[PDB]
C-alpha cells in the first residue's frame, strides 16, 4: 500500500529524452513530503497543485516520466517552453497539473572520454503534441531533395548524442528528470497520501 517512487527516482539507468520512460502509478499511497524532503533535487516546481498539501488530495492516475537532458535544458521541462527538448523530445501541455523534479547526475551519467549513450532528437517535421513520444529514426530531409535512407548534404540523421564528459560546465552536464502528472478522471481515485 506504498507508492513505488524509489523504482523511478533511484533508478540505475535513465532513458534518453527522446525515448522517455513512463511509469503508471496506481493503487498506492504516496508521501510527496518525503519526496520534497530530499535535498538532492536542484529543481522542484509544481503546477496547478501546491507541493505541500499534496498528501490530502486523491488522483485517479499518476504518471512518472523520467529521462536525462543537459542542465541548460531543465528550463524546457515546463508548460509553454520552446527549444529542441520541448519541441522535439518531451512536451508538457499548457494546463499541466503536476510537478517537475530534476537533479544533477554528473556523478552517474558522465564517463571519462565521453558518454554518448544519451541521445536527443535534433530534427523533426513538426513539433510534438503534449506527452507524445517519437522514437522514429527516419532520415530528416532539411533540403528540397529526397534522402532515401542516406545521410548526406541536407539529409540528417535525426538523433544526436550528448557529449557527457565529467569536465563539462554545469550547463552541459547530465541532469535526471522526473515529471509527475496527476490525472483526475471521473474514475476510482487510487493514489492518495493520508
Amino acid at each position: 500500500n506504498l507508492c513505488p517512487f524509489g523504482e523511478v527516482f533511484n533508478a540505475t539507468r535513465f532513458a534518453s529524452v527522446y525515448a522517455w520512460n513512463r511509469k503508471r502509478i496506481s493503487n498506492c499511497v504516496a508521501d510527496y513530503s518525503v519526496l520534497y524532503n530530499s535535498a538532492s533535487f536542484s529543481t522542484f516546481k509544481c503546477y496547478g497543485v501546491s507541493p505541500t498539501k499534496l498528501n490530502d488530495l486523491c488522483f485517479t492516475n499518476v504518471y512518472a516520466d523520467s529521462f536525462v537532458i543537459r542542465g541548460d535544458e531543465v528550463r524546457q521541462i515546463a508548460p509553454g517552453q520552446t527549444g529542441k527538448i520541448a519541441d522535439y523530445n518531451y512536451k508538457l501541455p499548457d494546463d499541466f497539473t503536476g510537478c517537475v523534479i530534476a537533479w544533477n547526475s554528473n556523478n552517474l551519467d558522465s564517463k571519462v572520454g565521453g558518454n554518448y549513450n544519451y541521445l536527443y532528437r535534433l530534427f523533426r517535421k513538426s513539433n510534438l503534441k503534449p506527452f507524445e513520444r517519437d522514437i522514429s529514426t527516419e532520415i530528416y530531409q532539411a533540403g528540397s531533395t529526397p534522402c532515401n535512407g542516406v545521410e548526406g548534404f541536407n539529409c540528417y540523421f535525426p538523433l544526436q548524442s550528448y557529449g557527457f564528459q565529467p569536465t563539462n560546465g554545469v550547463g552541459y552536464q547530465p541532469y535526471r528528470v522526473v515529471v509527475l502528472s496527476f490525472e483526475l478522471l471521473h474514475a476510482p481515485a487510487t493514489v492518495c497520501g493520508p
Epitope: 533540403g143 531533395t145 542516406v150 548526406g152 548534404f153 541536407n154
Partner: antibody, heavy 119, light 111 residues
Framework: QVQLVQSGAEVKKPGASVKVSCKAS????????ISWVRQAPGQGLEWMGW????????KYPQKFQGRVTMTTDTSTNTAYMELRSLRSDDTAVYYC????????????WGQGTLVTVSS | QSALTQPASVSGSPGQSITISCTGT?????????VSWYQQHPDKAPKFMIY???KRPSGVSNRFSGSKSGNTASLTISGLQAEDEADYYC??????????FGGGTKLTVLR
C-alpha cells in the same frame, strides 16, 4: 529547358583568386543542388564541393577545405565559385552542374570555364 | 576520398558489347546504390548517363546498362557504335557528404 551558362575562360597569375559565375535557368533553382567539378587538361574529373541554393548549406572535400568558397544569389539564379591561392595545378576546366544531391546524379552540366594559372 | 579505379582504356568491335569497370571500397561503392555514369566527348562537358547504378535518365539509349557486384560497378554498352567513342567516368557517394569520381576510361571503336 535546363541551362547552366558559365563565365568566360581567363588567365590568373599564381596566388591570385578567380570567381566563376554559373547562371541557371529552365528549372527551380533551389529544387536541386549545385556541384562544381574541375578537370585538369587530359586528366579525370574532380569533385570540388556542393552548395544548396535552398538553405545555403555547403560542403567541400578536405583537399579544397579553406581555399574554395561557393555562394548562391537566389535572385539572379546564379552560383559562384571562388578559389584563392591559385597554383599551377589549379589550371583546369571548371564545371558547375545541377546536383540531385542524394538523388545520385549531376543532371545537367555547364559548358565549363578554362582557368589557366600562368604568369 | 581515394580515387575510383577504372581501366584507362576499353576497345570493342562495332555491334559488340563492352563493359567498363569501376572499383572502390566498402565505404563508397559497397555502401550506397548511388553510382552514376558520365560520357564525355572530346572538348565537351560530360553527359549524365546512368544513376542509382542501373537507371537511365530519359534520353539515354537502352543499350547503356548498369551493373554492380560487391565493390565494383559496371557500365555496359551494347550494340557498340562510333558515337560511343568518348571518355566514361563513374561516380559514387563516399559518405560524409562526399562525391568521388573514377579515373576515367577511354572507349575506342575498332574498325
Amino acid at each position: 529547358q535546363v541551362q547552366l551558362v558559365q563565365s568566360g575562360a581567363e588567365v590568373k597569375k599564381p596566388g591570385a583568386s578567380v570567381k566563376v559565375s554559373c547562371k541557371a535557368s529552365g528549372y527551380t533553382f533551389s529544387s536541386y543542388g549545385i556541384s562544381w567539378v574541375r578537370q585538369a587538361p587530359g586528366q579525370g574529373l574532380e569533385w570540388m564541393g556542393w552548395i544548396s541554393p535552398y538553405n545555403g548549406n555547403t560542403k567541400y572535400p578536405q583537399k579544397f577545405q579553406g581555399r574554395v568558397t561557393m555562394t548562391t544569389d537566389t535572385s539572379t539564379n546564379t552560383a559562384y565559385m571562388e578559389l584563392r591561392s591559385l597554383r599551377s595545378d589549379d589550371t583546369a576546366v571548371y564545371y558547375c552542374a545541377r546536383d540531385l544531391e542524394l538523388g545520385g546524379g549531376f543532371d545537367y552540366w555547364g559548358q565549363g570555364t578554362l582557368v589557366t594559372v600562368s604568369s | 576520398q581515394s580515387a575510383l579505379t577504372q581501366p584507362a582504356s576499353v576497345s570493342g568491335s562495332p555491334g559488340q558489347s563492352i563493359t567498363i569497370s569501376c572499383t572502390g571500397t566498402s565505404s563508397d561503392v559497397g555502401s550506397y546504390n548511388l553510382v552514376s555514369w558520365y560520357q564525355q566527348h572530346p572538348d565537351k562537358a560530360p553527359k549524365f548517363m546512368i544513376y542509382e547504378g542501373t537507371k537511365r535518365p530519359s534520353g539515354v539509349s537502352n543499350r547503356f546498362s548498369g551493373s554492380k557486384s560487391g565493390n565494383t560497378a559496371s557500365l555496359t554498352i551494347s550494340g557498340l557504335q562510333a558515337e560511343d567513342e568518348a571518355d566514361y567516368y563513374c561516380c559514387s557517394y563516399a559518405g560524409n557528404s562526399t562525391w568521388v569520381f573514377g579515373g576515367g576510361t577511354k572507349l575506342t571503336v575498332l574498325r
